[PDB]
Design a protein around this ligand. Structure first.
Ligand SMILES: Cc1cc2nc3c(=O)[nH]c(=O)nc-3n(C[C@@H](O)[C@@H](O)[C@H](O)COP(=O)(O)OP(=O)(O)OC[C@@H]3O[C@H](n4cnc5c(N)ncnc54)[C@H](O)[C@@H]3O)c2cc1C
Ligand SMILES: Cc1cc2nc3c(=O)[nH]c(=O)nc-3n(C[C@H](O)[C@H](O)[C@H](O)COP(=O)(O)OP(=O)(O)OC[C@H]3O[C@@H](n4cnc5c(N)ncnc54)[C@H](O)[C@@H]3O)c2cc1C
Ligand SMILES: COc1cc(=O)n(C)c2c3c(ccc12)OCO3
Ligand SMILES: COc1cc(=O)n(C)c2c3c(ccc12)OCO3
Ligand SMILES: [Zn+2]
Ligand SMILES: [Zn+2]
Lengths: 230, 230
């Protein structure tokens, strides 16, 4: 239907398993008639570092540079670097934002971490006050589509890595929910490097198949209990 | 004595509160006679992105780029980029690695996330298999010194942000413990931007005091129970 989707994609190799997941999302959401944009961060050589090059006008406090303060002001003044505001426009217009990435150290690859750090600035994505359920991106859906080295077995409460939900907290709750997104259940594609060719094909078609009905899903309850239980 | 400390620091501003915490750690550990090295990531313009530039000469599969495989082989064949190997030398010789950074999105700034992604490579920090305590950095101590925007009250189990310990999991357990580090209790300096003056002087003083007996400390039990349990 009449919806805009932004896919923020973080993998170096177009032939990868992540590449395939990205392309099947674009294929399926495009088939449905959705408007689809992809920010392919490596191909863009997206700048991950939060630096004073991100503000182009007079700083509030040139004596002691505080990145959150300076970017909050710059956002209000329209003196942010244009790579940041280009991304903000995509997010602003999106109804759904999908993040497609390999798990790096229980988190996103740094190039995508730098997208969150630099694009979700104060004034745009949240304000103090104006976060979690009062976040500035309220009304928008977000979803993490994550691939791993580790097996599903390894990511259980009594497996070596602990439950997969534990590493989702800082991203789902600390970032997405904080900015006001409603979070859809994560898509985790476990261990495609270990998986057989039939199992890989299965994981790709499960994602394609889930996307056929993605607009009918409810968000998760993004709370400590969902993530950690008890 | 004789101990070597590496401090991996990630703040843009030498006059910041992180800056002061890094400086008192250098001052105190230097005073004790320890060997100290600092990796000032922003001043080094450290590269955060995981790309094929990290491998010199020629790829072990130039048709499909797999970062994990390529860096593992590059490590074995002494063909990693020199920014990464310079960091690996400092880590290899270190008895204690302290990370000094402001919390960005429940995690490390992207520039320090990229140090983790690119420096802690397979063959160096862990093997597959070969992790947690068959992790290659066993014997070394690691410590997170983190500063926050949010007050300690916000970081309680039924505060908005949830417990501090919940966001420590991917860093302490998924990264530091996985590589074989023993983890010291984190130093968390809550909300300096809204502290006095005193209080702030006091937080800087307390870190210095703690570093006086850092070598007497016992590592935390780095378990799901410690982070999430009761
Ligand atoms: C710095 C670093 C940190 C990491 N940290 C962690 C961690 O904390 N936890 C953890 O679990 N893992 C971790 N990993 C490993 C893991 O997340 C990755 O290896 C990744 O998830 C695998 O995804 P990929 O797309 O790169 O796989 P690929 O290697 O690209 O996929 C396996 C492939 O199937 C492919 N394929 C592509 N398209 C298709 C298709 N359409 N159908 C069938 N097969 C297809 C390829 O041909 C290849 O055989 C880390 C890796 C690195 C480099
Ligand atoms: C992209 C981004 C994401 C963020 N995400 C989060 C998050 O997830 N959770 C969260 O809680 N917060 C978050 N924050 C807020 C961030 O963690 C805090 O802004 C930061 O930790 C403050 O530390 P600082 O060193 O920059 O403080 P500074 O602004 O540098 O310091 C505060 C004050 O201390 C003064 N000072 C310096 N040295 C001394 C000294 N020796 N004695 C006394 N005073 C001194 C400085 O002059 C200044 O007045 C985020 C910020 C950004 C920009
Ligand atoms: C430290 O987290 C990991 C957990 C983990 O379970 N696996 C399988 C990893 C992996 C890597 C790199 C890291 C991890 O390359 C291939 O498999
Ligand atoms: C989870 O993210 C935050 C939690 C949080 O508790 N606080 C206070 C934050 C903050 C930021 C940015 C993010 C956060 O700028 C100043 O204060
Ligand atoms: Zn939440
Ligand atoms: Zn652990």
């Amino acid at each position: 239907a009449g919806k805009k989707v932004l896919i923020v994609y973080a993998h170096q190799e177009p032939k990868s398993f992540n590449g395939s997941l990205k392309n099947v999302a674009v294929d399926e959401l495009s088939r449905q008639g959705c408007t689809v944009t992809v920010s392919d961060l490596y191909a863009m050589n997206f700048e991950p570092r939060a630096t004073d090059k991100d503000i182009t006008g007079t700083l509030s406090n040139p004596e002691v540079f505080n990145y959150g303060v300076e970017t909050h002001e710059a956002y209000k003044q329209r003196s942010l670097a244009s790579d940041i505001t280009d991304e903000q426009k995509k997010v602003r217009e999106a109804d759904l934002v999908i993040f497609q990435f390999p798990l790096y150290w229980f988190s996103v690859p740094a190039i995508l971490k730098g997208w969150m750090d630099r694009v979700l600035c104060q004034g745009f994505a949240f304000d103090i006050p104006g976060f979690y359920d009062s976040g500035l991106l309220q009304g928008k859906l977000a979803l993490l589509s994550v691939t791993t080295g580790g097996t599903a077995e390894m990511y259980t409460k009594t497996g070596v890595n602990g439950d997969s939900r534990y590493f989702l907290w800082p991203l789902q709750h600390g970032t997405l929910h904080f900015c006001g997104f409603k979070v859809l259940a994560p898509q985790i594609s476990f261990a495609p490097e270990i998986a057989s060719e039939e199992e890989r094909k299965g994981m790709v078609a499960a994602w394609s198949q889930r996307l056929q009905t993605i607009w009918k899903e409810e968000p998760i309850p993004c709370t400590a209990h969902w993530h950690f239980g008890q």
